[PDB]
Symmetry: none
Subunit: 40 residues, 5 copies
């Protein structure tokens, strides 16, 4: 009869991500393919 | 009879992402393919 | 009989994204392919 | 009769990720394929 | 009759990850394939 199936590769029910980036410093150079939330 | 299936590769039910980026510093140069929420 | 299927590659039910970008600094040059919410 | 199956490769019910990045220092150069929440 | 099965490769019910990265130092250069929460 009934079949309930829940198939999720990533499941997150409650999350709180905190990223703090601070860069006081001079003269830094980078090549970044993909950046989320960051400082060069 | 009934079949309920829920198939989600990424599921997020509650999330809170906080990104802080601060860059006090002078003279930084970058090549970034894709940037979300960031400071060069 | 009945089949209910919900197939979503990304599902987000509740989210809160906060990005803060601040750039006090002088002289920075970049090549960015795609920028959402950022400071050069 | 009934079958309930929940198959999730990653499941997180409650999480709190805190990343603090601080970089006081001068003259650092990098090649980063993909950066989330970081300082060069 | 009924079968309930929950099969999750990674399950986390409550977590608290804290990463602190601080880099006072000058002149460091790196090649990083993928960086989450770090300082070069």
């Amino acid at each position: 009869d009934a079949e309930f199936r829940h198939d999720s590769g990533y499941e997150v029910h409650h999350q709180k991500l905190v990223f703090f980036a601070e860069d006081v410093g001079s003269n830094k150079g980078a090549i970044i393919g993909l950046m989320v939330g960051g400082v060069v």
